[PDB]
Amino acid sequence: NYQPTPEDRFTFGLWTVGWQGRDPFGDATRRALDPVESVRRLAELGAHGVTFHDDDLIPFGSSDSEREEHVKRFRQALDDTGMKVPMATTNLFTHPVFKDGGFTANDRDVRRYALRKTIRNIDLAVELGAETYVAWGGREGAESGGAKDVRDALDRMKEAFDLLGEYVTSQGYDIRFAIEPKPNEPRGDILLPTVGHALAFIERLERPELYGVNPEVGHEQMAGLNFPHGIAQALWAGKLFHIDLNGQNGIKYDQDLRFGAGDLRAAFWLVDLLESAGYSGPRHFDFKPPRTEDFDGVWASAAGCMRNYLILKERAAAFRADPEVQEALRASRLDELARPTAADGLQALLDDRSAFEEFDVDAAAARGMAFERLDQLAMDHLLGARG
Amino acid sequence: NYQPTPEDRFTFGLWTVGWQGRDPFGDATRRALDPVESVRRLAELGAHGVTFHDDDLIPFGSSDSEREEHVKRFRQALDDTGMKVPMATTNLFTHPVFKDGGFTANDRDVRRYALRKTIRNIDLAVELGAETYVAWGGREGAESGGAKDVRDALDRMKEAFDLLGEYVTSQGYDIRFAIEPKPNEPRGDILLPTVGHALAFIERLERPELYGVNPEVGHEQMAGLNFPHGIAQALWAGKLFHIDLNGQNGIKYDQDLRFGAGDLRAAFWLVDLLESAGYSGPRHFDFKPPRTEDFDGVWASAAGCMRNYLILKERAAAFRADPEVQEALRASRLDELARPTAADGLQALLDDRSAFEEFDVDAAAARGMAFERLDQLAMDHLLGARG
Amino acid sequence: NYQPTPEDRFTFGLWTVGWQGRDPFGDATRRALDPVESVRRLAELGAHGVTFHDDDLIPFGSSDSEREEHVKRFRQALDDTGMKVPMATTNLFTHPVFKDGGFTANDRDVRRYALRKTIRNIDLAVELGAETYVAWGGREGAESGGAKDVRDALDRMKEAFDLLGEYVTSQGYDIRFAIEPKPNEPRGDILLPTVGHALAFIERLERPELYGVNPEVGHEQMAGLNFPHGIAQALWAGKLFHIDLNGQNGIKYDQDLRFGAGDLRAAFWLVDLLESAGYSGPRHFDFKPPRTEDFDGVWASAAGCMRNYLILKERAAAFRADPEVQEALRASRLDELARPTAADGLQALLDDRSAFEEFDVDAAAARGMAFERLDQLAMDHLLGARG
Amino acid sequence: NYQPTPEDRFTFGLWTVGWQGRDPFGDATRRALDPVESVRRLAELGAHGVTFHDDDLIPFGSSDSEREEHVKRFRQALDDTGMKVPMATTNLFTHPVFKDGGFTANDRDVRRYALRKTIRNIDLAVELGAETYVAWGGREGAESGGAKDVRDALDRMKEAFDLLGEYVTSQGYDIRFAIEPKPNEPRGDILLPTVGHALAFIERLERPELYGVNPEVGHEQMAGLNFPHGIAQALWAGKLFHIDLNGQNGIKYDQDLRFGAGDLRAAFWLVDLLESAGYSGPRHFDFKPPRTEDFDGVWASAAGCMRNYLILKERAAAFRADPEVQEALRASRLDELARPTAADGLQALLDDRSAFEEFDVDAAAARGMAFERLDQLAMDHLLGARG
Ligand SMILES: [Co+2]
Ligand SMILES: [Co+2]
Ligand SMILES: [Co+2]
Ligand SMILES: [Co+2]
């Protein structure tokens, strides 16, 4: 079992399976992939669609004629396979002109070029049917304190995103924006480093309803944070527009391992949350097949992404449907957590002697929470060791 | 030189110099301090004021009569010294009843008790002249994934803070609330773990103008984040109500070292930012004199907090006033960062061929940013090695 | 299934299930446990034995008469249950006299007291049948650079361990020493912070054959290290005398979660290594039942430690016995890794043109390693999703 | 002042100032540097010498004739400038053939090629006058647990280093080997991840006296470790053959910032230790000028490396020469730390009632260590704020 179907909404970036294995210390170990072949190979694996940076699809500096031919070859592959394009984004980090950022580069003319390069690809994204446009400000940041006034940089970041919102509104486009946070790498520190910082920034834009987040498993874990906890706050705010699934082994460089690798229990609690909250967006894999692999290992790693999600989905469903677990959840008072603290109102709480004057603090302190039994039941379900 | 004066607005928590040295592996190494003696000793050192948890001032379970005597003894010490009380907060973490949290405990009756305990101390804070009321949700969190539905917990957290805002409004109190984030410890993960998460949460309250943040140097660094960067976003949003100054040596347990210790360059860039942005609030030290020290080392460590701030203030002022630095800032185009990207508007940017069609991407890519020369000038100023 | 038996050699410290829930921010949530009841309760759970600090068994400052009665009550419980005592250790960290360390305290008279306190408990350990004596230097370290000359401290550390080795040799005791490394907490930095540093230090003692390591899962992970990798180097050196099993969620305070929690895949690879290398020592759990739990949750958490080990043992055995895995291991050339690089000798390697002059570097570069397929087979086995 | 002279023994790798700015997300921002020009430019800056990988000097795949011309052009630049070559090393990480390692690659023929490539460059190093040969096993490691049997890998690592030692002995070469540890990146985990693991491994080689360590500031800090503490253990063992100086801002990707940047207080305590222990080897800078910089910023960053060392040297000397500091060191009993615990021997310690039976544990517990006053004196000296 555990066979993906386009109904599962699994998507892959062209840059993921297409990664050649260039890391900061070694040359590429794999030849470049034609975007057309990647689309065909992913379709055979059961994927729902692909995503792209502008420069993944149209090589940098291409003429409007060559650009025309690239889009046509790509769209023919989409038609031949039934693959969708739910998301697109801009490469504002590879070319040396972006070495100090795009939207927040110190040089004003670089910032204007970064906006024009973005707007050009929004047009293409809408043509191809994308519903979400992702922004990863990988070069927005600094290695030293004096190089960037962060208040001025946030002014420039806000100005860029308002202008992009004004453009999609004036064009009548049906597309939303999602910010993909990352705490560091390639810059020493990157602006808007976590999901929380991105959510706070969004509330200061002119049209906040146009903007959400695209959190990535590995990036929040590069700051040692609880990724399921962060996704829950994003859902609670109504801002989970998209999500990047992969693996990461703690606080170190951005590994981009296949989903399921890294923190396995965190992946279980993530799928539990996404499935019970009814997240209906794409399940997007932003990962890198290790450079030890040939092309056969590339497709095996991409297949593993989808397989691990489906296994975890099965185990999280069985966990929540188990009547013994439902009983344990009541023993830990998860049901009381969901009830209002004071629906009777402030004045009733103040006049309630059972809440303070006559509250038996020692009797309440004595109640065990029963969390460890519940967590071992979750472990048994994850490992398939219930019976 | 480097002598503090109450005009410098340096404050200390009673729990800081009063810490007895109890850590998870060892007994206390110092006897308890009378709050009256701490106020007198801090006044002699040049401090501006003190802060307190309710249970620092009035021992838990005290009668209304003993409580009366404690407040009176305290206020007499404030009058004898001229010390102020700019901030107060609630202890919702020491007593075993709070072992699963206060505002977000699974048990509903514990949540109601936590609200009543808080409201009682808001009354006392206003009486004593506090302008800011701090909330540190140290027990709001979890060690395992099934123990806490984070969406429900955020519902309960929002409900608590709205009720507190409704109370201070109905009483006509002139006091604001500040959330002090912490990523972990004592809980495995703590809700609202960074300044960003706290800022985002605040925008969902009913009266957001009543709530800001109280970031602590060490806590953002426990997630490997750039503390000056986070303070800048808090200032940019208008939410820096208060700040906790200390030291921390990277990602590990919460050290609470004296300010200046830990990341020294981060402390320099922090003081630069606070002084140039015109932060006018208290400079509050939330620190622990190491348990290796006797009472003489306690007062030496508290004196060092204030000394290091004043030295860093002098060096950051000299850095910004140096005409060679002002020249280097222009060489790195910090002046262009502060200018609007597109004050001419979206339509003018789209019709501007110098921004894309005729932009010389290679000429712009060739410009060095000159950041390293600027950063060595900052190092020379920090070390007093200019000449 | 998954029922422990004393044949599985599972052991627990008295301080583990006996932990009262005192953390740096809150009072104890559980009453103290009689060591006799802990022995009886662990025997019922299927445990093989217990371990103890001197001060866990005999309260500090006890007379030789009360000490006599404590040992007698304890030994009667061991006889009534069949429980063993394979390991003992000294508490050189709780009492305030040890606030700057024991073996490496700056004060010479404290160092001499620390040696005498240790020697007294070695006598008791041998009487009770312990084969390993563990040393955790939790207070050996510093919060600041000038407080400790590390070369002098290592001189004092070496002097202490040589003296202990001279004592057990002169007494004819059959006991070995094991060092338990920890990188930090409670001290800002702790000496001998990892398994590697401890192994290197041991080679400088007078009788190195008497000393090995007692690594703990959580402690190596507090430095972001690969715990299975560290255990493999300890086995390779012949120094794995003992091991502490628990869980930890990355780089933060020492969590001491039940084994299986934390990094689940790391726990799988650990059990694989221990079982295939034929580690025959105790499987010791150095963990803390969370302070949210009552006594029922304490025993459930201890039962979970043993259960998770037995599940992981089953899955690692099935992984290694799978002929498809054995085939994949050959596809990744694990068999070639085990063969000598140059058994033909140096001169034969130099005269071998197939090793350099005629080596086809591009043909070898093209071979995929097939690691991702192998790792997904390990994931399928871990999750019980093979079929 | 603060002007370097070749007497200060400052060295730079050709790959440092020669770094083109290729990181995992962006193209190079600087053109390649001729090794001859780098030697001339570093000589003008006051450097003592340079170091090189084989492939830095002789491009990969070069004929024996072109190789001859490269060495000749290089040696002429050394003669024209007076620059020395104290250290050389092998590139066993860039070419795709090394994607699973060199000495510990699973494929046996790759391991033999890696040994031959190394031996060829040892010949060149000795010709050029190098005294130390550095080994950085950047590709020795794994991303997943099943890919590498670490015991077998350590067997292959030991076999490689013994063979290299047999070669330099048979040739009568006067050169030593130094291992440069790194915990991760580019591999998920790297073998021998810290200075401690490298020191322990060395004691298992056939000729341990031939091997030491080359620790790097940033690498130990990528595991959150205290770099001065690790250097002290390396000195204590007699194994500090060489050292790499740079900066790093905590646990994240390998930043390789200029020395002085990153953890400034750690850099102060490092220079204090190196200068007081009489380290006489090269002061080598393994750093990367940020890719934001042009060639002018490259030379400014390299000049800053040497400047910051000389400033820190001055401040550490003034700290140790201050009679008030010498007094504070006695107040903290640093003098007692250096005295033997029990030069009177074991039997005298056992018969000494002042060490246990009559030891006043409470009087000793009451003595403050006075560490905070001492550490603020060190801060005052570092900042030049004594007077
Ligand atoms: Co990533
Ligand atoms: Co703190
Ligand atoms: Co532990
Ligand atoms: Co490095």
Chains that touch D (3 or more CB pairs under 8 A): A, B, C
- CA C11 to CA C42: how far, in whole Å? 9
What are the residues of chain A with a beta carbon less than 8 Å away from any beta carbon of chain D?
21-29, 93-96, 98-100, 138-139, 143-144, 147, 183-186, 188-189, 222, 249, 251-255, 257, 261, 290-292
Tokens of B307: 């000394």
Q: How close D97 gets to chain A, by Cα (Å)?
A: 8
Alpha helices in B46-107 (DSSP H): 54-57, 64-81
The distance from CA D302 to its chain's CA centroid, rounded to whole angstroms, is: 17
Considering only CA atoms, give the Rg of chain D. 23
- Residue B48: what residue type? H
User: SS3 for D148?
Assistant: coil
Q: How close B170 gets to chain C, by Cα (Å)?
A: 33
Q: At how many degrees (to 10) do helices A371-382 and A264-277 cross? A: 90
Backbone angles phi, psi at D341, to 5 degrees: -70, -40
Parallel, antiparallel, or unpaired: how do β-strands D189-190 and D141-142 relate? Answer: antiparallel
**D297, B372 Cβ separation under 8 angstroms:** yes
Cα(B290) to centroid(ligand 3), Å? 21
- Residue written as tokens 């794994």? D142
Q: Is the link from the previous residue into D186 a cis peptide, with omega within 30 of 0?
A: yes
**D221, D262 Cβ separation under 8 angstroms:** yes
**C357, A358 Cβ separation under 8 angstroms:** no
- CA C167 to CA A175: how far, in whole Å? 77
Tokens of D156: 């292959």
User: SS3 for A14?
Assistant: helix
Range of the domain at D142: 1-387
- In three-state form (DSSP H/G/I as H, E/B as E, the rest C), the secondary structure along chain C is CCCCCHHHCEEEEHHHHCCCCCECCECCCCCCCCHHHHHHHHHHHCCCEEEEEHHHHCCCCCCHHHHHHHHHHHHHHHHHHCCEEEEEECCCCCCHHHCCCCCCCCCHHHHHHHHHHHHHHHHHHHHHCCCEEEECCCCCEECCHHHCCHHHHHHHHHHHHHHHHHHHHHCCCCCEEEECCCCCCCCCEECCCCHHHHHHHHCCCCCHHHEEECCEHHHHHCCCCCHHHHHHHHHHCCCECCCEECECCCCCCCCCECECECCHHHHHHHHHHHHHHCCCCCEEECCCCCCCCCHHHHHHHHHHHHHHHHHHHHHHHHHHHCHHHHHHHHHCCHHHHCCCCCCCCHHHHHCCHHHCCCCCHHHHHHCCCCHHHHHHHHHHHHCCCCC
Q: Which residues contact B338 (CB under 8 A, 6 or more apart)?
A: A149, A152, A155
Tokens of C178: 């094991």
DSSP A183: S
Closest CA to C386 of C339, C325, C345, C336: C325
Alpha helices in D86-138 (DSSP H): 108-128
Considering only CA atoms, give the Rg of chain C. 23
| Mutation for testing the A interface, residue in D53, D292, D308 having most A CBs under 10 Å | D292
Q: How close D49 gets to chain C, by Cα (Å)?
A: 30
* B115/A277 CB distance under 8 A: no
Q: Which residues contact A273 (CB under 8 A, 6 or more apart)?
A: A228, A231, A232, A235
Alpha helices in A82-142 (DSSP H): 108-128
- Residue B382: what residue type? L
**D137, D185 Cβ separation under 8 angstroms:** no
Residue D299's alpha-carbon distances to C272, D12, D22, D46, D288, in angstroms, are 51, 12, 18, 12, 11
| Mutation for testing the A interface, residue in B166, B233, B372 having most A CBs under 10 Å | B233
Backbone angles phi, psi at C284, to 5 degrees: -100, 135
- Residue written as tokens 């740096």? C24
Q: Is the link from the previous residue into C186 a cis peptide, with omega within 30 of 0?
A: yes
C56 among known catalytic residues: yes
Provide DSSP, A281-294: S-EEE-----TT--
Parallel, antiparallel, or unpaired: how do β-strands C211-213 and C244-245 relate? Answer: unpaired
Closest CA to A328 of A318, A319, A339, A338: A319
Q: Which residues contact A313 (CB under 8 A, 6 or more apart)?
A: A271, A275
Closest CA to D312 of D233, D217, D206: D217
Backbone angles phi, psi at C383, to 5 degrees: -85, 0
* B250/D224 CB distance under 8 A: yes
Q: Which residues contact A87 (CB under 8 A, 6 or more apart)?
A: A11, A51, A130, A131, A132, A133, A134, A242, A282, A284
Using a 10 angstrom Cβ sphere, with 0-12 exposed, 13-18 middle and 19 or more buried, the burial of residue C110 is buried
- CA C111 to CA A272: how far, in whole Å? 53
Q: How many other CB atoms are found less than 10 A from the CB of residue C64?
A: 7
- CA D215 to CA D243: how far, in whole Å? 5
- Residue C138: what residue type? G
For residue B61, the number of C-alpha atoms closer than 13 Å in the C-beta half-sphere is 4
- CA A182 to CA A254: how far, in whole Å? 9
DSSP D128: H
**A374, B146 Cβ separation under 8 angstroms:** yes
- Number of independent structural domains in chain A: 1
- Residue B31: what residue type? R
User: SS3 for A52?
Assistant: strand
Provide DSSP, A107-123: SHHHHHHHHHHHHHHHH
Chains that touch A (3 or more CB pairs under 8 A): B, C, D
Provide DSSP, B255-317: --BPBTBS-HHHHHHHHHHHHHHT--S-EEE-----TT--HHHHHHHHHHHHHHHHHHHHHHH
Search chain C and give the residue with CA nearest B185. Answer: C253
User: SS3 for D176?
Assistant: strand
Closest CA to C21 of A365, B137, B150, B31: A365
- Residues of chain D contacting B221 with CB distance shorter than 8 Å: 250
- CA D298 to CA A193: how far, in whole Å? 28
Considering only CA atoms, give the Rg of chain B. 23
DSSP B101: -
Closest CA to B340 of D355, D39, A111, D369: A111
Tokens of C300: 């459930």
Q: Is the link from the previous residue into A186 a cis peptide, with omega within 30 of 0?
A: yes
User: SS3 for A190?
Assistant: strand
- Residues of chain A contacting C309 with CB distance shorter than 8 Å: none
Ligand sitting nearest the alpha carbon of C256: 3
The distance from CA A299 to its chain's CA centroid, rounded to whole angstroms, is: 21
Tokens of A86: 């739910």
Closest CA to B250 of B261, B263, B259: B263
User: What is the count of residue pairs from B and C with beta carbons less than 8 Å apart?
Assistant: 100
**A178, B364 Cβ separation under 8 angstroms:** no
- Residues of chain A contacting C308 with CB distance shorter than 8 Å: 379
Method used to obtain the model: X-ray
**D199, D243 Cβ separation under 8 angstroms:** no
- Residues of chain C contacting B189 with CB distance shorter than 8 Å: 249
- Residues of chain B contacting A336 with CB distance shorter than 8 Å: 106-108
User: SS3 for A366?
Assistant: helix
- CA C247 to CA A265: how far, in whole Å? 12
- Residues of chain D contacting B258 with CB distance shorter than 8 Å: 372
Cα(B257) to centroid(ligand 2), Å? 9
Provide DSSP, B1-55: -----GGG-EEEEHHHHT----BTTB--SSPPPPHHHHHHHHHHHT--EEEEEHH
* C222/B252 CB distance under 8 A: yes
**C182, C148 Cβ separation under 8 angstroms:** no
Q: At how many degrees (to 10) do helices C323-331 and C371-382 cross? A: 160
Residue D295's alpha-carbon distances to B362, B375, D51, D81, D261, in angstroms, are 16, 16, 20, 21, 20
Q: How many other CB atoms are found less than 10 A from the CB of residue B230?
A: 29
| Nearest-CB residue to C188 (from B29, B99, B255) | B255
Angle at B134 between CA B131 and CA B135, to 5 degrees: 150
Q: How close A14 gets to chain D, by Cα (Å)?
A: 15
For residue A40, the number of C-alpha atoms closer than 13 Å in the C-beta half-sphere is 10
**C222, C180 Cβ separation under 8 angstroms:** no
User: SS3 for A185?
Assistant: coil
C-alpha dihedral (C105, C110, C111, C115), degrees to nearest 10: -140
**D183, D137 Cβ separation under 8 angstroms:** no
Cα(C316) to centroid(ligand 1), Å? 30
Please state whether A368 falls in left (phi above 0), alpha (psi between -120 and 50) or beta.
beta
Q: Which residues contact B303 (CB under 8 A, 6 or more apart)?
A: B45, D376
Tokens of A267: 């992946």
Closest CA to A49 of A20, A88, A19: A88
Sign of CA dihedral A139, A141, A144, A150: positive
- Residue B20: what residue type? Q
**C270, C316 Cβ separation under 8 angstroms:** no
Q: Which of A56, A242, A284, A381 is catalytic?
A: A56
Residue A34 among known ligand-binding residues: no
**B132, B175 Cβ separation under 8 angstroms:** yes
Chains that touch B (3 or more CB pairs under 8 A): A, C, D
* D368/B297 CB distance under 8 A: yes
Closest CA to D195 of C200, C184, A251: C200
What resolution does the deposited structure have, in angstroms? 1.9
Q: How close A5 gets to chain B, by Cα (Å)?
A: 29
Q: How many other CB atoms are found less than 10 A from the CB of residue B253?
A: 21
- Residue written as tokens 């100090």? A100
User: SS3 for D190?
Assistant: strand
The distance from CA A208 to its chain's CA centroid, rounded to whole angstroms, is: 19
- CA D88 to CA D84: how far, in whole Å? 11
- CA A13 to CA A246: how far, in whole Å? 12
Q: Which residues contact A386 (CB under 8 A, 6 or more apart)?
A: A318, A322, A380
C-alpha dihedral (B120, B122, B126, B130), degrees to nearest 10: 140
User: SS3 for B210?
Assistant: helix
| Mutation for testing the A interface, residue in B63, B226, B367 having most A CBs under 10 Å | B226
Tokens of B381: 């100023």
**A334, B149 Cβ separation under 8 angstroms:** yes
Provide DSSP, D205-272: SSSGGGEEE--BHHHHHTTT--HHHHHHHHHHTT-B---EE-B--SSSS---BPBTBS-HHHHHHHHH
Q: How many Å from the N-terminal Cα to the C-terminal Cα in chain B?
A: 19
- CA D337 to CA D344: how far, in whole Å? 16
- CA C147 to CA B291: how far, in whole Å? 13
Using a 10 angstrom Cβ sphere, with 0-12 exposed, 13-18 middle and 19 or more buried, the burial of residue B284 is buried
Question: Among all residues of D, which ones are annotated catalytic?
Answer: 53, 56
**B244, B214 Cβ separation under 8 angstroms:** yes
Alpha helices in chain D (DSSP H): 14-17, 35-45, 54-57, 64-81, 108-128, 150-170, 195-202, 217-221, 227-236, 264-277, 295-321, 323-331, 334-337, 346-350, 361-366, 371-382
Q: Residue C50 pairs with which residues in a beta bridge?
A: C12
- CA A340 to CA B239: how far, in whole Å? 28
**B139, B92 Cβ separation under 8 angstroms:** yes
User: What are the DSSP E strand ranges found in A165-267?
Assistant: 176-179, 189-190, 211-213, 244-245
- Residue A43: what residue type? A
**B19, B33 Cβ separation under 8 angstroms:** no
The distance from CA A176 to its chain's CA centroid, rounded to whole angstroms, is: 15
- Residues of chain C contacting D163 with CB distance shorter than 8 Å: 341-342, 346, 349
Backbone angles phi, psi at D247, to 5 degrees: -135, 155
| Mutation for testing the C interface, residue in D226, D264, D312, D362 having most C CBs under 10 Å | D226
Residue D46's alpha-carbon distances to A257, D83, D247, in angstroms, are 45, 10, 21
